[PDB]
Amino acid sequence: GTRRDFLYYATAGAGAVATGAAVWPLINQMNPSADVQALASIFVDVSSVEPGVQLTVKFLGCPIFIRRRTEADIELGRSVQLGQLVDTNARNANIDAGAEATDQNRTLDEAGEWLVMWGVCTHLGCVPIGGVSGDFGGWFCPCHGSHYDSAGRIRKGPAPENLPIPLAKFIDETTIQLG
């Protein structure tokens, strides 16, 4: 009856489980190894940064932009209305996830002088060119033509989101702790 029919199911089922247990470690070995997952924090000396200079620093194998924004940059950033932005989320790890992309919520300080963000284009990962580049007085990504404004917010091109801002805070007058 159904005694040898259950065996052929149980046998195949056991074989399927055994195969899955063998295939998973062949996939999971390509995921980040323990040295990579051991994420580390860093400190950046900032006393040497004058307004209008962008400092580019490596963090977790990727660029982080630390720009001391000029007066023009700050004024331009605050003049943009929310309804004119492609992406209205602040993309800021330091505050609420739902915060709006106002210029105030894009800087570490209330004066809005210190713009710290991942220098990684949100389209396909290239590094946008700074020094007030592009059509919005910010950054231009040369890989597929994304334009960011003076607060790093996406305004034009294929990129869907504003450049993300990592966990960052001033430890003292001249040192930022990233992460």
Binding site: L7, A10, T11, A14, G15, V17, A18, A21
Partner: peptide
């Protein structure tokens, strides 16, 4: 795993 699988494969 292989003990169970071997028994099932024997039957």
């Amino acid at each position: 795993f292989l003990t169970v699988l071997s028994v099932l494969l024997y039957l």
